Coordinates of C-alpha atoms in Angstrom, one line a residue:
Chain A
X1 CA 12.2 2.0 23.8
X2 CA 10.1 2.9 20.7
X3 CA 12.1 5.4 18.2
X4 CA 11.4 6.9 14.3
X5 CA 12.9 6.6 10.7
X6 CA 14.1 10.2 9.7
X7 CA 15.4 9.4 6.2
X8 CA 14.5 10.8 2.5
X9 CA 15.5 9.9 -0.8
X10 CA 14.7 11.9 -4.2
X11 CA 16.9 10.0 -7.7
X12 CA 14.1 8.5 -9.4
X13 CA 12.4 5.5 -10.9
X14 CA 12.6 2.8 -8.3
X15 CA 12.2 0.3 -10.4
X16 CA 14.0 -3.3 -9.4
X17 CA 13.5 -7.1 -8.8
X18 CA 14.7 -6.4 -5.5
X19 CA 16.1 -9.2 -3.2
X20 CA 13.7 -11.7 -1.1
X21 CA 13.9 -11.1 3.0
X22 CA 12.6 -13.5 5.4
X23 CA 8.7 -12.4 4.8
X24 CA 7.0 -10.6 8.3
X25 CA 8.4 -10.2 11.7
X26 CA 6.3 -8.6 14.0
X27 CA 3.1 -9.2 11.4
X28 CA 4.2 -5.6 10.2
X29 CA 2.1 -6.4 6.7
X30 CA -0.9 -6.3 8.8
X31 CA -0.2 -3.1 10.4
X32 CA 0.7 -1.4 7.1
X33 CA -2.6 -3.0 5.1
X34 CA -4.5 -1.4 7.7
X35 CA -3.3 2.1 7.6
X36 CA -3.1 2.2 3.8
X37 CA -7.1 0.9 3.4
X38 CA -7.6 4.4 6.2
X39 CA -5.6 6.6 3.3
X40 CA -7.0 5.4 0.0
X41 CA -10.7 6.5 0.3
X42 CA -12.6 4.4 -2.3
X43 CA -13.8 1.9 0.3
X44 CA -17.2 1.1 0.0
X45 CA -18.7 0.7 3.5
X46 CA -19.3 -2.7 4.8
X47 CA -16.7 -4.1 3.1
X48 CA -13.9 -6.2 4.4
X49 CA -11.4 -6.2 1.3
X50 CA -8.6 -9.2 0.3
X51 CA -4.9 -9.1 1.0
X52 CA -4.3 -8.4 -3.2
X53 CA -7.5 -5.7 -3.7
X54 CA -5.6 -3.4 -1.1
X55 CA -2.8 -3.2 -3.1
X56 CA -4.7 -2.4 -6.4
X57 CA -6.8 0.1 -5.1
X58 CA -3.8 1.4 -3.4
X59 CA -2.4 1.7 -6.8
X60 CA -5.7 3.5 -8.3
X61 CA -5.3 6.3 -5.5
X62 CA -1.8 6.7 -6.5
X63 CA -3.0 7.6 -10.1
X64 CA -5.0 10.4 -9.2
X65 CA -2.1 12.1 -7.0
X66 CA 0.4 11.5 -10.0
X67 CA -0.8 12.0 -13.7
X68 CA -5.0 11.9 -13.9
Chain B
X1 CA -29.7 -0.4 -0.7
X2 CA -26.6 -1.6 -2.4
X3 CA -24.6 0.9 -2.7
X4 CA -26.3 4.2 -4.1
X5 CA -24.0 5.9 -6.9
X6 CA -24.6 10.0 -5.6
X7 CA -21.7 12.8 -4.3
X8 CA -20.7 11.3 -0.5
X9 CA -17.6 12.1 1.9
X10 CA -16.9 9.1 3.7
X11 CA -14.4 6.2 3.3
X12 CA -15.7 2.8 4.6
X13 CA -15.1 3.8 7.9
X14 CA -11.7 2.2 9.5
X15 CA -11.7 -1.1 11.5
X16 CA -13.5 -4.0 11.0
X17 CA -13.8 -8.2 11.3
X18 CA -10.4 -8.8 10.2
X19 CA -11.2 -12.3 8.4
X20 CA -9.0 -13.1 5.4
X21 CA -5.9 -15.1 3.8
X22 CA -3.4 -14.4 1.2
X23 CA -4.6 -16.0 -1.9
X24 CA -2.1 -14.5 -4.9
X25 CA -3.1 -17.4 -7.3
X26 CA -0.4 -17.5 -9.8
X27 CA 1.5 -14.0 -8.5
X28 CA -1.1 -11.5 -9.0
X29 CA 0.3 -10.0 -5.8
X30 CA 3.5 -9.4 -6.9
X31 CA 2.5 -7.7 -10.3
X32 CA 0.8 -5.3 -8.3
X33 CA 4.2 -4.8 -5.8
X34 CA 6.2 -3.8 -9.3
X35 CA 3.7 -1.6 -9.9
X36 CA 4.0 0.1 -6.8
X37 CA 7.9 0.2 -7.2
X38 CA 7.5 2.2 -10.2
X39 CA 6.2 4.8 -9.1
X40 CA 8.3 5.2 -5.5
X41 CA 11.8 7.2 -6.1
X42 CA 12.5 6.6 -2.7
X43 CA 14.4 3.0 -3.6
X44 CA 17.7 2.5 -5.0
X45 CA 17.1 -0.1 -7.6
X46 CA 18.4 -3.8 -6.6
X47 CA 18.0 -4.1 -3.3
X48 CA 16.3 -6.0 -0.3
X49 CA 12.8 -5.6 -0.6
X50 CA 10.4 -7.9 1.0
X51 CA 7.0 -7.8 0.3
X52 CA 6.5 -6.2 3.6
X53 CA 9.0 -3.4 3.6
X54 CA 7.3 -2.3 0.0
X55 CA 3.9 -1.3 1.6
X56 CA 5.9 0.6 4.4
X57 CA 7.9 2.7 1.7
X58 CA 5.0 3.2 0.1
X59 CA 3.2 4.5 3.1
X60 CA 6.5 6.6 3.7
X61 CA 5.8 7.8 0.2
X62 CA 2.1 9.0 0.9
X63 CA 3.2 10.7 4.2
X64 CA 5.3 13.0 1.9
X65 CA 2.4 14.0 -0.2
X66 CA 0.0 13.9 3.1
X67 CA 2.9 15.9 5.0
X68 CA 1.7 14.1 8.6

């Protein structure tokens, strides 16, 4: 009754069209959308943000921790 | 106000009115999902990824370089 994920992977890349799953079980895309908006810092305050705009701006934080 | 461009250290806060719907348009979402997969060498290349289980691995992939 409640448990974690200890795994890690380190080839490369990534990259894939990847298969389609039977989209949300347990809402788990709202849990995740809320945690990453608390990671990325360049939210403006009094903003609620869309669904796609996370994602984006997930991506723009990503950036800086790669190649700036 | 309006959002006054000086030197600050706070993100938008956390928590809010959670009031939204996924628009994606023509598959804006998606393109931004690819994007994400590029840069994650945690995935093996062809395999089952929802649109879910992306943002997860991607958090996975942050907790690495946030070491939580």
């Amino acid at each position: 009754m409640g448990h974690h994920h200890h795994h890690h992977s380190h080839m490369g890349g990534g990259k894939g069209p990847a298969a389609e799953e039977p989209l949300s079980l347990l809402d788990d895309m709202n849990h995740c959308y809320s945690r990453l908006r608390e990671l990325v810092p360049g939210v403006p305050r009094g903003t609620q943000l869309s669904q796609v705009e996370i994602l984006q701006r997930v991506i723009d934080y990503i950036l800086d921790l790669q190649v700036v």
